[PDB]
Amino acid sequence: MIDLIVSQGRVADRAAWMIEGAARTARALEERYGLKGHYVGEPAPHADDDWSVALPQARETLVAVREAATESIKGDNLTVLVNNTCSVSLATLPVVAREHPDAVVLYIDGHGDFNTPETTDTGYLGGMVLSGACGLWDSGHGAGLRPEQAVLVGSRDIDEGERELIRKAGVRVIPPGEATAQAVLDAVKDAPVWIHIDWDVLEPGSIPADYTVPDGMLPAQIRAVFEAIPAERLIGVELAELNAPADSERAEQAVAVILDMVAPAFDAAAA
Numbered sequence: 001m002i003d004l005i006v007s008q009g010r011v012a013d014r015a016a017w018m019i020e021g022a023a024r025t026a027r028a029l030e031e032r033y034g035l036k037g038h039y040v041g042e043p044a045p046h047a048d049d050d051w052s053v054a055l056p057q058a059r060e061t062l063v064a065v066r067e068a069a070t071e072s073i074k075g076d077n078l079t080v081l082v083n084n085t086c087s088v089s090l091a092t093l094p095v096v097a098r099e100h101p102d103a104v105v106l107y108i109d110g111h112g113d114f115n116t117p118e119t120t121d122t123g124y125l126g127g128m129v130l131s132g133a134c135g136l137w138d139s140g141h142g143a144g145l146r147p148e149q150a151v152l153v154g155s156r157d158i159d160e161g162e163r164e165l166i167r168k169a170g171v172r173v174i175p176p177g178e179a180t181a182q183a184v185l186d187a188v189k190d191a192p193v194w195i196h197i198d199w200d201v202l203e204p205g206s207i208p209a210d211y212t213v214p215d216g217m218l219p220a221q222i223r224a225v226f227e228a229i230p231a232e233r234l235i236g237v238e239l240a241e242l243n244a245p246a247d248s249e250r251a252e253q254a255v256a257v258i259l260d261m262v263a264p265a266f267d268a269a270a271a
């Protein structure tokens, strides 16, 4: 079975429509799979605040997501989190690492999200998520994910300083052109798997651009990963950072593509 948890509280959001994009994604999954999501948190406007301000503002939402994710992970369902921002995972990844200390996290993102308070150029909490879960800095929500068990998938054009933090910590990076389903399967070895996706991993627009080599990952590559992870080894999936307004045609088209990508894994868990 699938347990759907949806964040609707601000967690450092700097984009206007990621809370709405999460809501629309959750609605599409509810309709397709016959689920009702557990919605957590109260919306608030986006702002360009420092992580040191945004993080305590998000405490209530993050604690409530932690509690819901803990309950889902303790059972025997596929835990699906539809999150406004990657920063929600500061609460979920420590739970995953505690409950499944052998799990590999596939952190699928166009960015590394591996900055610390000392290295961030923008102050953005969302750029500090994977490093916080791995304990390079203290988010107040725990850590415990071993960097040797974290794999960045689809990341590219990483700042040279952040890239060396990643390398020093032992986090592997599989860029889009190397991120075939088999390359990802080979990186997880015999471990159970947690998948975290930031949609900025995807190549922008043009749908299939037949004569251009993409810089990002294509939807078919994401779908292939979901097809390749065995259902009995998939712990959970987080879907984050769809910036699409409510009631827009854009959100309708985006969620259709999302449903296509996740279907292999979600269909198997529903069955």
Ligand SMILES: [Mg+2]
Pocket (backbone or CB within 6 Å): 178, 183
């Ligand atoms: Mg390789």
Ligand SMILES: [Mn+2]
Pocket (backbone or CB within 6 Å): 086, 109, 111, 113, 126, 198, 241
């Ligand atoms: Mn991200």
Ligand SMILES: [Mn+2]
Pocket (backbone or CB within 6 Å): 109, 110, 111, 198, 200, 201
């Ligand atoms: Mn990103």
